[PDB]
Amino acid sequence: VSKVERLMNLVIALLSTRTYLPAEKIRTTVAGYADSPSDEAFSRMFERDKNELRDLGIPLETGRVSKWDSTEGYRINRDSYALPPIGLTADEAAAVAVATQLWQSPELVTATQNAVLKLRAAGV
Amino acid sequence: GGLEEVLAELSPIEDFSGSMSLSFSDPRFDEVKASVDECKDKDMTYAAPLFVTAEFINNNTGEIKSQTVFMGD
Amino acid sequence: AKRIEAGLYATQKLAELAEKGEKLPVQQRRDMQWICRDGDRAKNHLLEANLRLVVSLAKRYTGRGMAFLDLIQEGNLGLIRAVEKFDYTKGYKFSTYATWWIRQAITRAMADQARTIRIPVHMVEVINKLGRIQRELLQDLGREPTPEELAKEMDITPEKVLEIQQYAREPISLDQTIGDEGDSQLGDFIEDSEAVVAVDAVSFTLLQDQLQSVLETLSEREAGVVRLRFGLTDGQPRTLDEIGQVYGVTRERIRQIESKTMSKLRHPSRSQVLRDYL
Amino acid sequence: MLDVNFFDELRIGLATADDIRNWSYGEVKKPETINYRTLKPEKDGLFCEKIFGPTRDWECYCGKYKRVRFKGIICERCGVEVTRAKVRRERMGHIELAAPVTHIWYFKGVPSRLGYLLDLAPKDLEKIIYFAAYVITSVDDEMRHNE
Amino acid sequence: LYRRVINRNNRLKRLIDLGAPEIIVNNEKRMLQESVDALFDNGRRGRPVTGPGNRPLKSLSDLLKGKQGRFRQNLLGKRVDYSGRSVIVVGPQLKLHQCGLPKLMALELFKPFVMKRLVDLNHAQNIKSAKRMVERQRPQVWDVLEEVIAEHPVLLNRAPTLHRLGIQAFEPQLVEGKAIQLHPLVCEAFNADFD
Amino acid sequence: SQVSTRLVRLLNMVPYFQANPKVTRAEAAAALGVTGKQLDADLDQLWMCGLPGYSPGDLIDFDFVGDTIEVTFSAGVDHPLRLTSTEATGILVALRALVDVPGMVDPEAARSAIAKIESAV
Amino acid sequence: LTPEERLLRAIFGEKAREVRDTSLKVPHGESGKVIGIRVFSREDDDELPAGVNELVRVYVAQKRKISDGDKLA
Amino acid sequence: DLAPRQVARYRTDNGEEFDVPFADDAEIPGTWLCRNGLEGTLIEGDVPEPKKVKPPRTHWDMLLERRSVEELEELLKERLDLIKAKRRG
Amino acid sequence: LHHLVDDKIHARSTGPYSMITQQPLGGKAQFGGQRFGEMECWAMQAYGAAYTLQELLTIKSDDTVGRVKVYEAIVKGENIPEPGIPESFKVLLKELQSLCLNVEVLSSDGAAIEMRDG
DNA sequence: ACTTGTCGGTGGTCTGCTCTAACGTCACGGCCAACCGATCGGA
Ligand SMILES: [Zn+2]
Prior knowledge:
part of a larger assembly, 9 chains, A: 3 strands, 12% strand, C: 278 residues, mainly alpha, DNA-binding, transcription, activator, sigma adaption, RNA polymerase, rnap
């Protein structure tokens, strides 16, 4: 399918799970991971996808399935995922209006755009 | 008593060689762990600790040891 | 021991000269065969003469799950190994090496063949160590030791102890008597939880009929799409791409059709009948 | 199976080794029942799914096949047939003994049937079959009468 | 028992493969014979094989034999559905063909009929709603019950059953109590008294 | 990474749609990416992702009645992402604080925004 | 899950949660009034058996009058 | 409607033939654990040669590990001399 | 006295079953059924009631398919279907075969009827 | 340019196999305890 679809499906699945989902169940359940030729290509691809997700900022925790289970799975802490509450609205308008005016460094402008988009997704 | 009787009937514990022996004596009961109401409320057992003095004798060397052993509730 | 070693060497040399060798003289072949047979007889004689230490060693392990004769046989296997590994040059008597091997074999076998649910030896050792530490703590403190004390005195987490204690449970028997007389058993109070309730089945059949009647209020396209997508047709659902390829339409079109059909089905006139089935 | 009115007779008889190994779907080789960790049946044990059948419905041991469309096939990796879980009360196993063993019913009975058949006292049978006395199976009388 | 048989068979295989002296092999063969005998019939020869608590194990012959065996306990007599049990009192106003059945007991016995009948009368939209109404004991259930038990005989039995007249069919009538009302003239057949 | 930006954009777009009641098409096509042509292509891909099983009632839903894009099913995606440690938040805070303009929103806007952002991070 | 159950849950929106209800319910033919609740928790240092985390006991009291079928003597 | 499948024929060492139903897109194993409990190969002229397992430790290997060739040769020579003297005087 | 009807009254239509033999449990505390013992079977045989006894043994205790079919027929209002084969008989046959006994059911022709229906 | 499959590596835990050299050498923990009739193996 598509890499973006795999990433989005993985994010949603790890968000909605209640216990640590092992990678073996991730292969069969999450769409896009079932088209790999062998178990090593899937393993490397899943490792790279985990690295990308962790570098992005999404909290991807690895831990045991449960007390009496030696399997090791992955989850995403929904409480640590973000912070819902936001402050006033008048100050945020001034912050956005001054978010970026003349900066040219790609990292700076990308970071400012990401922050503005997250603020819009959390109200204005 | 019953405990004294069973300890006396078991006091000499010697091996085949006859060089070592173990003896038990002086059964003693301490205070109760908890009252009846506490035991019934918390699902416990109304019991008291039991301590028996055990003495070890090594016949060949003649050196003897004695300690107070806890036998249970 | 010297006879055993001589017989083994003679057998090996005879085997080597049999294939890619030379025509051995008749007397040489006779002597090699005699030495091999003498070595086998000496090995058997040593085994039989030492088949009394095994019983003494196994006497102390009676009453711990395994039977006395099984312990004796495992000790006999250990004795065979000890005979195989005994070296006479060191000058020590056979009763030490034999004791070591017999004890090892008996302990390993009792670790393996004594539980209905088998536990690996590396964990049976941990369970035994935990029990010994618990006994020592009980003697020292005077009270029953809590998991905290065992955690400190066993240099393990205070959680692994719970798992270890929960792995030590032995299954009870379904044939044990419950009452005073001999008419009741534990297996008569156990409910089969995988049997058909005989009421959920008819309810499911009626639900299928009602759902078919409700879905027959739509057009052929939407009904077919829903049946293919949810797997209501025979046994299993399909995916957007597969249904689109079967119907020759893009996946976005299939998604739009499904969204419209689901919106139509949420109308009360199509869900009031099905409300009571959920 | 169905139509109890179609049952004409109920015959009983001795079962030979051929019948015993024709009933069985496999041989059990290990005294294991379930795994102490996953609580899952072992392989070639007393609860092996490859021999007796799946614990789940339409599911194999390794989980490769989990659908009704895979009916009547055998998984190429775990060897478990994909069928209903109710076959676990219809399939038998067998154990291949390394030495023949007599049936207790036909030896320790009153009257003993092996003793009547072989004209041997029950004490002689108990001595023989429990490894306490040797018995001459056959003797070459022609050779003895010549030398 | 199967585990013992398998363990001894495997040990015998190992001993035979190694080449052990005949004494050990003979002992192992005798143990295998004893294990198989204990599997088929535990106790006929020698001492019974016991588990925890010095309780002898249960073999196949023990399954097939005795009053608690397979035949007598599970083939010549079974436990059945649609059956109840209660204390009996005396109803002198009943007829010889009538009995007094408690309303709750009759409701539980006739639940499958009551569900259908109260679905038909449009008291419930489907089977699940009718089952919920029966479980909650709604006021409109009882009327339906009086329709379903009419001219539907029930068999009354009192143990021990010494002759045929220990099981008799009666026409039920709903009563407000929890005790079955029995006709005074059928006691001698049942050998029943109201104590 | 040119895929990571899209992924973050979608992960914020879904909560944005769920938090603005019946946002018209033009507002989305002007706010989250000026190119409105790719907005439809991104909505089509969002319509395909959802909960495991990927059956109706598990994928995310929408209503394209007209210009308003409303979400009826979110598949758990309701909150936005957290501002990553340093990076975006660090740059935004640095720009907000190191402003070289004489105060115009200083009294109760700039300081309040700075304090609230610092507390949120 | 069955396809019909999945379709019904999709229609009504009730998401299927991987938890099974095992609530303590009053047995058949029993009733009364709740007069006492006793709660034990491992996190509060209660001597519960191994594996058990929480325990709760409920006492239900009922006043019974004399009725047909009761035995007097 | 059922999934198409193939039937493989396996032969054990002691003249036993068995049928195993496999799927189409699956690697049919050359050797299989048959119903009798004995491993049996598949009937094919082009044999997919499986792995070869070498024998494990034996008594001679341990003896040679713990004793050199010279000592064993000397012991054998002494035993041969003893039996020669006992036999032919 | 401590013999009250509230603790004695019990009734059941369908509930939990056993594991080895698919028969209803026993006891008020388990929503079990009433035992129809051998004496009751003798009474039914003396009465001449073949059908009542047959249905009691088959479709109220052991006929696994028969129980659900009877419940469905009662709910939908059709006739009660014919009984099948009790599970206890199949359990007995397996227990006999495990004792190296060759028990086989023969049809009128003389062949063997397999008990692996399903 | 980004992705992706084959290749190769570090570190960790669960599981199974092998070895340990003073001398040591032929099991217990325990009833059974009715009371009748039938029957096979001894004397
Ligand atoms: Zn499989």
